[PDB]
Amino acid sequence: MWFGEFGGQYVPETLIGPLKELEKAYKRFKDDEEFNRQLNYYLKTWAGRPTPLYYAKRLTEKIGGAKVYLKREDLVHGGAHKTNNAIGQALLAKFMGKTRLIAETGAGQHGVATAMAGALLGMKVDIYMGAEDVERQKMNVFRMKLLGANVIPVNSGSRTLKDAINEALRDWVATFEYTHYLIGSVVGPHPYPTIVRDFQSVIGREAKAQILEAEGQLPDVIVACVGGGSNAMGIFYPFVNDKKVKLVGVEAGGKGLESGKHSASLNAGQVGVSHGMLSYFLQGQIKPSHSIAPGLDYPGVGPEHAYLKKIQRAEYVAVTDEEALKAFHELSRTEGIIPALESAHAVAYAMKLAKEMSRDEIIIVNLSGRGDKDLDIVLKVSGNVLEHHHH
Amino acid sequence: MWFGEFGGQYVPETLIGPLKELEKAYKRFKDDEEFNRQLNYYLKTWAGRPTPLYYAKRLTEKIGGAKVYLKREDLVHGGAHKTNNAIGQALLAKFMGKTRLIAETGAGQHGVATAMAGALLGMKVDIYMGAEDVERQKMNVFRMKLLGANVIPVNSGSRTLKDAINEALRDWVATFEYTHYLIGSVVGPHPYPTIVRDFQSVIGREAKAQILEAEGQLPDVIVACVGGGSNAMGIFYPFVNDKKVKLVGVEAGGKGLESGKHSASLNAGQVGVSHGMLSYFLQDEEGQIKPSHSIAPGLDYPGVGPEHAYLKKIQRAEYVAVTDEEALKAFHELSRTEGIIPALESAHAVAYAMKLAKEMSRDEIIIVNLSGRGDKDLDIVLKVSGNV
Ligand SMILES: Cc1ncc(COP(=O)(O)O)c(CN[C@@H](CO)C(=O)O)c1O
Ligand SMILES: Cc1ncc(COP(=O)(O)O)c(CN[C@@H](CO)C(=O)O)c1O
Ligand code: NA
Ligand code: NA
């Protein structure tokens, strides 16, 4: 239910019924032999798990400090970690007898992942997406439609991710008998922060096994970008009880923390109740975020991160648009890996942190997705660079 | 060198030395423990091998015939099988002491794969690409630039893949002491058809282990699309000596085999010589190499590898064609039914597998090589199919 003070289930009575049935089913099926037979089968044969853990040898040597490893969620089917949660919850929906999936999306990656998982399991898919996001993500919207999903543009409110979540919750209240609302991050009312984190925890379990195989020891630091916080919780959670392992979440610093154009909810947000949970939200109404990374757009953050921040188990930092863009280019040129702009925030901070650390020490960076989806954004900025040759 | 009467080394004397040195180096490193340790390390940790073998259960049940399995080369780093060969040859080049990679590309996929492998290994990369292809593939050209590679637009001739290969060979003759020419398909003079097939054979070795693990038996048919022929050779080669396993290569039927707008070199072409090999080519009465057409950008090489010409000759493999229309329907079908957006090249294989499955029995098994993912093709499909 709660993570310290944070999280909870602060919703109207119309949502209590749907959420209670979801909790019961989840407790029912999470450790069921037949459910896990199918989930592991799809994660293996369809999604391509396990993803590798890659030693960024050239990057490590260039910086001249700590060893930089990359957990390669960019290689998951769909090109992002979102698929892990999409498969888990969609299979849960199938086991519950649901025939329809709905989901919110901002960047379009979770919408694509949900569309993919729904197509896989023969379920109807409607994706709620803010009209301003629909406009910025033409090709992800087209991907969703190719996969058999319908994209419902949300014209209410600010026409962004927060509004898409609002419309999806309204839909689910009416249609929960046959519809499962597939939330895409560790956010919303209980049991969603737990369910999404549980379905992303495979990342950390693989990473722990892989780093023990590669280095004979646990990492000194784990760095992941934090939007809502699902990829970060996925890689963090299996290391939480290893006190050796430092955990660093990287939020979108945008145009600077002083500018008020960022998505650093943990850093500069206010504690409040929204979307059925107590957590940090940026504001005194909740406002749309800003980041070069379309995926770091949720105005709040998961309550388990708010908890880990308060008990000082994880540190949370910010990286600017400029810094993330530099890391996008650096990783591409140095390791031949084009990262998602979300993931590039984590790469950017890991590079700064590696410089200050010892050559015997180990950083794992969660590479939450690949950057094919971001090429239009990077082309637009790269085309506008003045004297690109000598700079 | 020869696959029956096909293959050879039809190059000027200036390239015999470089090809001899490559052949010597390859024979040495192919079975070297350290070379193979490093290659397998990069294929595992960087490229993400093994790729899974996926049972397309919904597609199988919709068609109501044979079991359709998909070898998921769409999940290799870069999104296509081209990476397997790019790493192999780039590592070979590094072991030979070379500092520079050059490569041809038409669709841009091999160009990207070469740029990725060169970036990984700290080598300079120049990609030769026909100006007509540069214009069609601006995002792949941009990918190559992001990876640190220099794309050289080829303005001579027809300004397509055949002209890029000619310029690449021109470069290599002058720069071979420090440059490796990283050919992207099972084409060119010996030893390239052999080397590329060997570096793609991992696909078939995995697929064989995976199908035995899944079903306890070898497949009845293997279906792969055939451009130059590398993804097909990769999945075919380990099953060649298994007599019961049928091999089906799928060429681009384009607007139709009678339309004169296709890339079916085995089905409709003539025996000829180009790019250092004796093989099947689409060539006119003047002996000149015709333009290829296909909705799939990657099925644009106007010939085919000599090992496929051989397998056709001895009737070990069958070669068929699938039209633009059929490939496009399969692109949509797979996306909707299995949640996998395939490359348009791979969709040719999917299209034929769907036709072939319907005729066959429910107990029988088909493996389709899904050579790449379709993210690169979304603009093409948006234009041709339209928005929804
Ligand atoms: C590749 C990638 N990496 C990271 C994130 C951040 O989300 P997380 O903090 O839940 O991992 C996103 C979010 N993307 C969400 C929100 O916009 C979506 O609807 O697609 C992403 O697409
Ligand atoms: C995804 C995919 N699948 C299949 C093929 C066909 O080539 P093959 O027959 O060598 O596998 C290609 C070729 N693509 C080549 C030739 O245009 C390139 O330079 O990129 C491809 O990109
Ligand atoms: Na946020
Ligand atoms: Na051809």
Side-chain angles (χ1 to χ4, degrees), chain A residues 227 263 265 298 300:
Chain A
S263 202
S265 296
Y298 185 58

mmCIF file of all heavy atoms in Angstrom, chain A residues 227 263 265 298 300, ligand 3:
data_model
loop_
_atom_site.group_PDB
_atom_site.id
_atom_site.type_symbol
_atom_site.label_atom_id
_atom_site.label_comp_id
_atom_site.label_asym_id
_atom_site.label_seq_id
_atom_site.Cartn_x
_atom_site.Cartn_y
_atom_site.Cartn_z
ATOM 1 N N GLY A 227 11.689 9.064 -14.923
ATOM 2 C CA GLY A 227 10.478 9.786 -15.289
ATOM 3 C C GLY A 227 9.484 9.515 -14.180
ATOM 4 O O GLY A 227 9.583 10.099 -13.098
ATOM 5 N N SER A 263 11.766 18.475 -15.495
ATOM 6 C CA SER A 263 10.862 17.447 -14.955
ATOM 7 C C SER A 263 11.400 16.806 -13.670
ATOM 8 O O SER A 263 11.097 15.645 -13.374
ATOM 9 C CB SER A 263 10.586 16.371 -16.009
ATOM 10 O OG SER A 263 9.382 15.686 -15.720
ATOM 11 N N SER A 265 10.899 16.237 -10.406
ATOM 12 C CA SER A 265 9.840 16.227 -9.391
ATOM 13 C C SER A 265 10.373 15.988 -7.978
ATOM 14 O O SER A 265 9.953 16.654 -7.034
ATOM 15 C CB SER A 265 8.786 15.169 -9.724
ATOM 16 O OG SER A 265 8.130 15.472 -10.943
ATOM 17 N N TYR A 298 6.250 12.960 -17.299
ATOM 18 C CA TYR A 298 5.250 12.826 -16.232
ATOM 19 C C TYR A 298 5.545 13.874 -15.148
ATOM 20 O O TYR A 298 6.682 13.932 -14.659
ATOM 21 C CB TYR A 298 5.230 11.411 -15.638
ATOM 22 C CG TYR A 298 4.132 11.206 -14.607
ATOM 23 C CD1 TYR A 298 2.790 11.415 -14.936
ATOM 24 C CD2 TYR A 298 4.431 10.806 -13.303
ATOM 25 C CE1 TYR A 298 1.781 11.239 -13.995
ATOM 26 C CE2 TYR A 298 3.430 10.629 -12.355
ATOM 27 C CZ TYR A 298 2.108 10.843 -12.705
ATOM 28 O OH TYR A 298 1.118 10.663 -11.766
ATOM 29 N N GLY A 300 4.866 14.106 -12.041
ATOM 30 C CA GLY A 300 5.224 13.549 -10.743
ATOM 31 C C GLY A 300 6.253 12.445 -10.832
ATOM 32 O O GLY A 300 7.006 12.349 -11.808
HETATM 33 NA NA NA C 3 8.912 13.783 -13.268
#
